[PDB]
Design a protein around this ligand. Structure first.
Ligand SMILES: CNC(=O)[C@@H](NC(=O)c1ccc(-c2ccc(NC(=O)c3cc4ccccc4o3)cc2)o1)C1CCCCC1
Ligand SMILES: [Ca+2]
Ligand SMILES: [Ca+2]
Ligand SMILES: [Ca+2]
Ligand SMILES: [Ca+2]
Ligand SMILES: [Ca+2]
Ligand SMILES: [Ca+2]
Ligand SMILES: [Zn+2]
Ligand SMILES: [Zn+2]
Ligand SMILES: [Zn+2]
Ligand SMILES: [Zn+2]
Lengths: 160, 165
């Protein structure tokens, strides 16, 4: 028999990401900085490293989109699903999509992009949802990575 | 804190299924009996329970369709691909699609909906294809039922035996 193995985690410690498109809600600069920040969250506590490609195929393809945007996990206008990301793996694995019918903001007026991104980037790293309300990976939107997550990611990749 | 499951599988033992529409070939009753039986193949050897919803959103949506029907895998007219289903996961995860350009039957002539369904639902639960030419999860259709042991050992690695009697 065969089942569908899951890529529990990335093989390599060096990962590439590409920001394909941009929300109208923040400067390009602010966006790039929000993601660099969201990757630092997990690079700080693991051997993991993130470098950004400007073209071509990357391990973590980041995009913004609305409704149906090419994977049949369609978004839903404003409110509700803020974003989503695929677990570690080839092809689609690791990719992060952000519902561009939400208002992304580099602060509090809307959903802070960096916060949501850092959350999503755990899903890209193999992290599942947490039930600890203090955990970044808690499903509900609300910087120091909480021990709950530090333990979760380290359990996979180890410390730095 | 939580980490992703080693393999694709359902997080809960209680799963829901909905027959979204029906094929013209067989009656509503034949279609529901074939699917109920198809599900029982798998619940009989695991702790899984399958409940049917008449409307709404189930873990496993079942529908019949032709050519392009709402995903990346269009059907192709008669013969060729008979059907397919997606592995466990959100949205269309676990959903099974049957090509309505085929002839579906509860007998031998045509394609036996029960047998194809049994195989497809295997997919819905996280089984891929076997290499054993006598495994239910063998990719190629053959008419004949006792669930082969490669399939049993396959599903139990995923969800355990349930009650072993
Ligand atoms: C005509 N077109 C096809 O067949 C294409 N098939 C499909 O799309 C497809 C979907 C599901 C099946 C299928 C295959 C085997 C069985 N189980 C059994 O037939 C079975 C019955 C049985 C009874 C006792 C023990 C073991 C058993 O196994 C049940 C269903 O086939 C396929 C062809 C091959 C390449 C890809 C495209
Ligand atoms: Ca939304
Ligand atoms: Ca990718
Ligand atoms: Ca907007
Ligand atoms: Ca066909
Ligand atoms: Ca589904
Ligand atoms: Ca038909
Ligand atoms: Zn998407
Ligand atoms: Zn999440
Ligand atoms: Zn389909
Ligand atoms: Zn198959």
């Amino acid at each position: 028999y065969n089942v569908f193995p899951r890529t529990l985690k990335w093989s390599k410690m060096n990962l590439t990401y590409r920001i394909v498109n941009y929300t109208p809600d923040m400067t390009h600069s602010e966006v790039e900085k929000a993601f660099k920040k969201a990757f630092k969250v997990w690079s700080d506590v693991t051997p993991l490293n993130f470098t950004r490609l400007h073209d071509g195929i990357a391990d973590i393809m980041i995009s913004f989109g609305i409704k149906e945007h090419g994977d049949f996990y369609p978004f839903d206008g404003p409110s509700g699903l803020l974003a989503h990301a695929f677990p570690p793996g080839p092809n689609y694995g690791g990719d992060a999509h952000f519902d561009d019918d939400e208002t992304w903001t580099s602060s509090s007026k809307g959903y802070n992009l960096f916060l949501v991104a850092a959350h999503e980037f755990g899903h890209s790293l193999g992290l599942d949802h947490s039930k600890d309300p203090g955990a970044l990976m808690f499903p509900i939107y609300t910087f120091m990575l909480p021990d709950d997550d530090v333990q979760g990611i380290q359990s996979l990749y180890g410390p730095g």
